[PDB]
Amino acid sequence: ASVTIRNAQTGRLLDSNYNGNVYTLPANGGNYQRWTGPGDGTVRNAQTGRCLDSNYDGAVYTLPCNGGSYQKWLFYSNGYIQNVETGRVLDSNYNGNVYTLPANGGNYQKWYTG
Template structure:
């Protein structure tokens, strides 16, 4: 239930009470203040927030509203991960590696847990993005 509520808050709830895709969202890491970014070849990293299309993400719902997908505005590719804890973008598909459970944290931040691996989206001061065991740390919180 908490995942659904956080996803609805993140997506915005329509007048009929159904979640609708939100576009043009930027995700800023709480620890580094860098924004989630990607490029045309599928690499995902963080950079200083610049308002560019590569830092804009469309959040979409999945079946049963148990998770969301993140589609990069510049590339049209979806945020993906694997069991080796790598994060990248690929052509959007219906696979669970592209589905993320959203948890709302304190101070208006969110954590994103990969549905397939159970690992959380994480980053570091070197601007790398990967997944790790969920630990409630500030490197796993995104505003």
């Protein structure tokens, strides 16, 4: 069981690499664009096994999963993906940058997961 996480505004897929960088890219069929969620709050890259992660400065990255709540995420019915620790929401732009920001209701902060 793995899902893609697609930005509602740009259509680009959340994606990450073994270096820990998180970004969005047009869908390319690769496993780096699939994510698993064991049900402990984590969103884990299907290819690298690293956990989606972010800090209070709004940086998003992956790290090996370490049990901290920076690596826990809440999926809302409106498509927000909120960081448990910071309460900021996963966000991205047309150029492929991924970050978190306080929720502003706009579509860049909305994601389709499936």
